[PDB]
């Protein structure tokens, strides 16, 4: 099965997990960052107004999460990241 | 698909069904443009394709529509909820 | 009062469109983006969230679910009809 053109198709498969720290109960993200340098490293931020830090080979090298100088919680609802393109 | 420093005009286009957002192109050379689909569905298109077997019109113009999305073949990667994002991870080192 | 009576799946209909072009008919799409809206934006402030509400949040996942699916299934078979 596939379109009548000469394509290929998506039977490979990794699938990897995400806000065992942030999780009614069930949180959802909103956006994915990866770094450029080590593109196995990455962030996910949510609308609880944190951002967890992960990558893929090796899933316990520093499973902290970033948040400002504030208390509480402050859903501040992240809906933009970035990466500055330099060292 | 335009350029800058070209003159007035697109130099290309792509189709699709149903809403496309969450876009982003291959970081090493112009082989593939993916997007993820409102409906969590993944598409990429062929650019490096010649133009035959596509819909032209006159004034010439011609369209471009390949692809095979996970809308057929069914499976789990689709979690059946919509995109948020997608980018190209360039850690092919085996 | 009248959107947790036994909401009405999604079903695809050709009859209608008999030009070959399916499509799903989600009937409750209010439902659904005000039960996520409701729980996300409840936990997010702090709030206490009914048992009401969540139970029929985690039906209205499931119907979201499904709906996706059904477009994808109708989504092939819009290709095929295009090839």
Known sequence: ?87 | VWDIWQPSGPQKVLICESQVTCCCLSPLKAFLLFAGTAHGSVVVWDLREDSRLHYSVTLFWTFRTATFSTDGILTSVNHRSPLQAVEPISTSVH | DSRSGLCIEASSRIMELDSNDGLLKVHYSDRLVILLREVRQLSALGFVIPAKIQQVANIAQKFCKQAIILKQVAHFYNSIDQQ
């Open chain 1, 1 to 87: 099965i596939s379109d009548l053109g000469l394509m290929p198709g998506g039977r490979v498969k990794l699938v990897h997990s995400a806000l065992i720290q942030l999780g009614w109960g069930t949180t959802q993200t909103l956006n994915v960052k990866f770094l450029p340098s080590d593109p196995n490293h990455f962030i996910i931020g949510t609308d609880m107004g944190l951002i967890s830090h992960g990558t893929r080979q090796d899933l316990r090298v520093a499973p902290k999460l970033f948040k400002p100088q504030q208390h509480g919680i402050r859903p501040v609802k992240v809906n933009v990241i970035d990466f500055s393109p330099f060292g």
